[model samples]
Target chain A: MKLIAESGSTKTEWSLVEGEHLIQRVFTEGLNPFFQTRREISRSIRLGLPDSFFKRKLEQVFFYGAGCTSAEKKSVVEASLVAQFKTPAYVESDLLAAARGLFQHDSGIACILGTGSNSCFYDGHVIVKNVRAGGYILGDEGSGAALGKQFLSDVLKKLAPQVLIDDFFEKYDLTPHDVMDVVYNRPFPNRFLAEQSCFLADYLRLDYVKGLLLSNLRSFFLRNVMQYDYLNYPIRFVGSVAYNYADLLHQVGKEFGVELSVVEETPMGGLIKYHAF
Target chain B: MKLIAESGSTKTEWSLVEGEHLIQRVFTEGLNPFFQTRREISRSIRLGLPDSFFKRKLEQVFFYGAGCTSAEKKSVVEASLVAQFKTPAYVESDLLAAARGLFQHDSGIACILGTGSNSCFYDGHVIVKNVRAGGYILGDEGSGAALGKQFLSDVLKKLAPQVLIDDFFEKYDLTPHDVMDVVYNRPFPNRFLAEQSCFLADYLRLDYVKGLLLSNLRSFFLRNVMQYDYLNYPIRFVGSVAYNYADLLHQVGKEFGVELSVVEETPMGGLIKYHAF
Candidate 1:
């Protein structure tokens, strides 16, 4: 059986590819070196597989996560998992994993818009170039975290109407202490705050959030995403945030004279499916 | 007589760097390539310089602005200034210019904390490495704009005490339209809002804003300023926000086990002083 993990800042969605069937599992946020220890990551999920599950025998396992952007990080992750899983484990940047899942190396833009927002130009089977998605400090545009962060600031500062503000504070009981605890007192509060922000999607209007995402996408296209001057391929997207807000991305892409393609949400699944074929 | 322009996103402080004496002039914000045109930048500043200031013998011109991080951006700026002044100009990343001005090739951390924030890890004359600062989208820590952006969000959401909320809204009318304009309607509203956030410094002593700045500095140290693998030098600072809250920066630097040497608030002054030598 081949196991694949699509890990993000706050959570990981996993699948055990057994021949024609994909058995999936959900786990708490994995892959961030900031929040969890190496030991914690090593033992986060227990893999116990019987030989009957895979008729062809598992050959390769690919794991993608938030901090898996560098070789050193990949090695560390590889070392942690090599003992439990016997398959040849291949590690890659989250963007690459997502791109493979979405477009399988086809020329297009692949975006990850869960807790963190990311977009890249993929030239089929590899990322040709990408605008770095600096963390929320500089650019995680159109993310649940970005919008929620904005939403939190509005609520705390009274930028929201008094009625809404009163309702939110009362409902959430978010004191300076709560913010302090998460932001300063806790380890990896950045990720935690970002994860919490995703819950706000139910409250804010789609246009307001879409506007924020558009601003971020514009930066990606204008600054980093535009650097690939060769292919004018359709822009494809991965990640739940981008997939959920596909219409807005499509609208914004049109405004910028680019075509938008919303690909399969679970890129790891796509990777598994492609590998199976 | 030599002309020196300390172009900040929030404000521009100009000086006539004449031999030993520095004559200073202040102007509204005008360094953005996207927002204000060259004509607008020039018109915003009414100085006593002769009509032939451009025609006058130009020695060297250094422009340290908000977004001067890449060669592509530098070229745009260089071309625009060359059009107006018709002089040979040396363009460097504003972060580099700032680093050079403060450290002058000394191995140290040179930081900017004005409307937006930026920093670079310099090994003497050359910047060996740096965290990519993606303006408001990704990596501006301890910035006036980030603080102000958060402040505006708090007000909109009404998360603060009733008294503080009432006071802020009364002090400044922050409509959703104003928020949208500051964020998206303009080219670089991050800079514009950061400029406006300078006013919040007056209100910084309030327990909320003070805690906020402290938290902001904490994030700065954790994310950008101190998280490096222990550079072999002390840290220095530039930008008004860092200068204004030097006390907090110093305290946090100590808490994070860093030796801090705040650079004097001089972009043009430092550049001219270094150039003179």
Candidate 2:
């Protein structure tokens, strides 16, 4: 039996597998080594998993997550997983998980567009050229957070179509002050912003909303993906934002003259298949 | 004797005047009715001013600030001033101050490019067509905060010139983590970001930095200033950012086919002059 987990900033998707056959799926709170201490990481895993699952004949654990780029963060995650699962663990950046998940031992450009956004050129095994994700404020152009940030900005500033703006205010009952307070004063602003992506999806029929998403995704390619060998390799994505808006993603890819394939919502399935021997 | 103030989010410029002659120029911590309570506002004013300021035979406090747009916020600020100075008080939005200060009772376009950015079409006495100066996240396109934000993004993502990148890290002794920590976790991120405008000035010789500033200012016009009758009005500016980057601002204005003039560092001088009557 093997265990694989893919963690973003807000949640972790876990899979238990025997050979190529899936056993069970589990979920836990998101863990980032940069933000979470070892004790807290251990605590989250311990509290999230079932007693019967822990009693299984576990073999090895493969963990891929945000903030696992640094050696120190990787060490922290590995140690926490080792203590919790009582098994050997391999910790890697979520980008690798994304690449393997998307291409499955093939070369491709992999992207993640959830609470954050990142892209990398992978040569079947490791990342050939990993563009700096730049996180929330600096980058994350096509990310849910980015989408939400722009959406809110447009709506609050009355730059959105008047009808859509009225509908939004009617649906959410949010004032500019409410939006500002959450964004500027509150913690996990990225999460707060990303949550609004659903609102965008709900209003996708609006031309204004659609254009906003297009420009945002376009920026993701222009700023992040453009740095990679996007023309030569296959392009793929895995995240809530990309999976939910696959149509627009394809549109953007078309605009840039590339064919984008295989936008999986989470990388766990790909990780599971890759681990199958 | 009268007291006048122009406050942004981080600092306030206070001017003491006696019948048109400038008596003293003082600075205090910035005040926002939306973020700080009346008690805190009073305390800030109490702590920031000198002993002699209170002893004077004062007429009124003509106060202007960020977050003073709503009536409730205006009342909050006005009450705080009344309690502190024991005199009649008039509080208005910083947009009005920018207008009154820049135009001095003449119809024109007034823009603020500081820790934040705002603009209004002032027809001499009052703001006739005030564009919503969406706070930090939604707007503030040409602001110091916006400039710093794009600069940091460029530097961190390696989208910047190699020499500038090397020079930046070496000069600041900052890693990606250091930049990320302050932006994502710390309080007063706008202030943190706005402060970096100075660093950009240090490297303005680089075409990349110049282009970056130009693009940001361009967005300010395209998004905010374009909404007003920019061509017809005599466009003027007030704030540290506009004063610091006047040359680039003028270049962008020229690109937009408008002649921008009178980039003042603070609105106190103009505010003091306007309040002389």
Candidate 3:
């Protein structure tokens, strides 16, 4: 049995591969070596996943994670996996996973537009260059948090039509002040902001939403991908935002004289392909 | 004797005019009825300003504030002033205060570019037209909060030079992580972001800082001021950001074919000017 894992700030996805096919997939709370203890990681796996994997003849555990930044940090992820499976475990940065999973032995640039935004130039196996993701507040241009923040602002300021505003309040079950509490006083404001982005999907038909989304994607392209040679290597995207807004993705990239496409919603398929177990 | 008061979220400025000239000036902790009770409002005035104003012969109190939006809310503010001074009080919106301060009796578009941004078309006495301020997250473009946010992002992402970043850390006495906490996890993020904008004044010589300031101001003009007939009336600015960046203020407004100028640092000057007793 082989296990391949991808863990971000919110959730961890685990895929078990047997021979040439992916057999079972499971999920657990996100495991950051920095935030979670080895025992905590083991507990989440034990609670949310199957116990048979531990008893089975394990082959290897490959993990790519948000906190797998340093050898010291990677050790925490490694120890948790090794302790549970008693097998060889390889740990690496999530950015490397994104690059490897997207490029898969091809030299190109990869970008993420999920809850947050990130970009890098990938040389098949390694990230040759990267632009810093200035978190949600500073530079998460075409991301869910950024989109949600903008949308909330439009609604609050009465710039959005009354139809949309009324519908939003009805769907959200939050008073206007409650919205203020979430964005200003609550914990994990970025997550809260990203959660509100889902409302944009149904409203995308509106011209206002389209303009907002295009402006967001435009900023993403200008500030991030513009730094790279996107004129040559079509900026490949992997994330929920990219997958959902593929038309706008190509639309904006075309304006910049580049043909771009979303490789996949998540890196799982490409990661599995890269492994080719 | 007449007392003119302007209260925002942070602090309140009070000007006392007695003849054809301004006389005494004092400050009180901000007294917004929505946030502060009548007792608290009176208490801040009692503690921060002169005690004689409460006991002396007072003619009329003209108060404008953030929470003075509705009749009921205005009642809260009025009640406090009435109780403290035992005199008649006329309370109005801070937006109106900005207008009266900037243009006085003239017809023009006046804007506040302090911790946040707001704009309105004032026709002599009242706001004839106005653009909604989308708060710090959505809009408030060209405001101290927006400028500070951009600066913080630039420094964190290494878009800003090391010297600036080092200097910022030294002056703020905060770790990079501390900065993260204040923005993402703490309260009054807008205030925190705006406070950081003060740091930019020292580094205005840098082209990068100038670009950031110009972009912020440009957004303010395009979104807020452009909504009005700037060709006919120059967008007069009142508030700290506008007063401090007057040179760039003219530069950006010129790009939009409008001649702009900062009326004063606070609406206090224009306020004092308006009530020339």
Candidate 4:
């Protein structure tokens, strides 16, 4: 049995593949080498995985994750995977995994649009060019976090339609002060902001909310997708944001003269198929 | 002698106002009650104020600070001022200070555009409506930090022209990793992001940079300023970002069919005049 994992900043998706078939799948808290110590990563994997995963004779392990940007970071992730499965592990950046999961052996562009956003040009196997997402603070355009950021700003400033704002306040009962306290004083601001994107999705019928998402999508294309050989190959995306907003994303793509091809909510199925074969 | 201060996340500006005449000015590191302990706040004021200020027997102190929202937060600042100046102090939110400084006896819209952005509808003496800036993460549209965030994203994604990116890299010599380290690991990411606005200022001749600034300014106006009785009163701004980008900001205002007036770099000068009288 082969184990394959794709990890983002918040969660990890694990797939167990056997002879061209997905045997099992699991979800666990994310293990970022940059933020999580080796021991913590090991502990999470140990607790998150079932006894069945360990009972099987595990063969090869491929782990792709955020913050696995350098050899040292990769080593940290590998140490956890090795300790868990007692097998040698190969570690790669999530960007590479995203590219492989989306394109298999065909060269194209693959992007992630969840809490954050990132894009890369994949030559079937390796990432040839990448435009860094810069996390949520500096980048993450066309992402859930970016959408939430705009929505919250509009709500706070009363830029959103009064109807939507009233509905939002009635449902969430959140004041500007309450939102400010969480963003300024609490942990995982990206998650907090991303969680608010649901509100935007609920009010997409409002022109203000639609315009905000479209403007952000234009920004993402100009910044992330336009840098590559964009017109030559299909562009695909994986993440809840892209999957949920694919219709609007396609509309924005039409405005930019670029056609979007595939959008999946998660890369797990693709990873399982790719690794199984 | 009286003292007036406006404190932001990075630094505080102080003005010594004495009976209708400006006596002196001082600049010190910022004191945010949310981040700094009471002792740290007191020590900053003690070390920052000169012996000359201590000798004057200050009659009154009015402090307007970023984190002085609640009574508890106000007491933290009040304690520092009382300890150093040996006088009672009045602490107000920075938004109130901006309002009072911009329009002392008149009612108008007041805004701050520094590392962050905020606006309030000031009815001469009190804030009737406030639009929170949400610091740098959730909002702060059209701020120096917001501008830097856009510029850094474009540069990192190679969305900016290669010529501009090469010029920026040669001048700054920063990798995406280096930038990420500061934003993710540093104490004041807003200040760090705001500092990078110098690069955007340098490249504003490019239409891309120019458009970015205009879009951000439009967002700021729509969210913060438009909800007030904007047309009836002069819209005033205070902060380095607003002062530095006033020309472009005015252009954006014209696009939105609103005229902007009273662009000042800091509230200290106006605060001095308002209090001294």
- Best model number under TM-score: 4
- Candidate 2, residues A1-277, lDDT tens digits: the string is 8888988877898888897788898889999987899999999998998886789888999999988988888999999998888999999998899998888888888999888898888889888888777777788889988888888788766888887777766777777777777777777888888887877798789888889899999999999888887898888999999999999999999999998877888988778889884
TM-score of each: 0.50, 0.89, 0.80, 0.90
lDDT of 1 at B196: 45
Clashing pairs in 2: none
lDDT of 4 by residue, A73-184 (tens): 9999998899889997999987777788899999998998888888999999788888778777778888888887777777776667888778877877777788787776
For residue A187, model 3's alpha carbon misses the true position, in angstroms, by: 4.6
Q: Pick by lDDT: which candidate is best?
A: 2
Worst 10 residues of 1 chain B by lDDT: B41-50
Which model is ahead, 3 or 4, in terms of TM-score?
4
Per-candidate alpha-carbon RMSD to the true structure: 20.6, 3.0, 4.4, 2.8
lDDT of 3 by residue, A1-277 (tens): 6889998767889999875488888888888887778899878877877876677786889899876978999998898888888899999988788888888899888998888888999987789998877778888889898888888887766777788889888988876777877776666778777776677888888999899889999999888888788887857888778788888888998898887755578888788878772
Per-residue alpha-carbon lDDT of candidate 4 for residues B1-277, written as tens digits (9 for 90 to 100) = 8888889877888888777677888889999998898899989888998888889878899999998989999998898888888887999988888888899978988998888888988888788888667677767888988887877777766667887777766776767677778778777878877876666777778898888888889988877778777887889999888888889988988887878868998877678778866
Candidate 3 DockQ vs. native: 0.44
* Fraction of real interface contacts that model 3 preserves: 0.62
Task: Tell me the lDDT of model 3 at A142.
Answer: 93
Q: How many angstroms is residue A107 displaced in model 2 relative to the true structure, after the best TM-score fit?
A: 3.7
DockQ for candidate 2: 0.63
Which lDDT value does model 1 have at A250? 73
Instruction: Tell how far residue A115 is off in model 3, in angstroms.
Output: 0.7
Q: lDDT scores for all predictions?
A: 0.64, 0.86, 0.83, 0.84
DockQ of predictions, in order shown: 0.03, 0.63, 0.44, 0.69
TM-score of 3: 0.80
